Design a protein around this ligand. Sequence first.
Ligand SMILES: COC(=O)c1ccc(NCCc2c[nH]c3ccccc23)c(C(=O)O)c1
Length: 266
Amino acid sequence: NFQKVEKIGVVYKARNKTGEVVALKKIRAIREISLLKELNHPNIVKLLDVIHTKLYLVFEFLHQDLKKFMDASALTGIPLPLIKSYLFQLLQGLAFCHSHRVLHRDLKPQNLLINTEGAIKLADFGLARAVVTLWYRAPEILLGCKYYSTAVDIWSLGCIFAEMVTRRALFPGDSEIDQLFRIFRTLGTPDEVVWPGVTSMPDYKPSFPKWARQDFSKVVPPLDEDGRSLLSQMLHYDPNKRISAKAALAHPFFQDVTKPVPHLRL
Ligand SMILES: COC(=O)c1ccc(NCCc2c[nH]c3ccccc23)c(C(=O)O)c1
């Protein structure tokens, strides 16, 4: 049914024998996933079909992702108005999915798809359970919290925001404890003062080193106080204190938001 075009489980660019070009995911429940076909938002990649016969998911196709765009933009950096537009749009997408009680759980630049018209869209949701990259994982997940909240996605998006600004990954760890300790060295080792209940987390150890907290002026330097304030709220340790997607959309950082068009080399 599909003429495979290129390898993008495994994901292929494919052509429907409708002429439509799509992203085809072969996975190698069915009722629950099918509900997502009719929940649509401009900032979420559209799920066109679900087929189980091996599980195939057919998605709308977009040509580039934010990881490729950040690498292409690394000599100059993404312009601040575009960073701001992308952050605003991703928060609109998260506000929508969270309002329908759907979490992403695995946001990273390579799952954020962009087009020539200035849009960015959430893709590659980690909905199966409902080298692994840990750089965007919320600290409650790393500490073994059994129940994720919407706050895990805000953490990941804050890490992505910092990376778009500074052109380097915020917390590039290579094991769960290295990831945790990279977070602790920058934001301070969490305690009951800033995160009530942290010492009760399944994987918390009293023997964790106690690092002091750095300053956000050192963390995302070029960024102004509106952006640093929003980032600090997206990176609160306590998931209950971390800002929601809806509240973040009202932050003063977005008062001058626009929708620029990026320069894409396809
Ligand atoms: C084993 O894999 C899976 O079960 C699975 C299920 C759904 C997926 N995406 C759904 C995108 C979506 C479309 N409309 C939405 C409204 C709200 C929230 C999300 C959406 C993906 C993926 O993106 O890969 C995988």
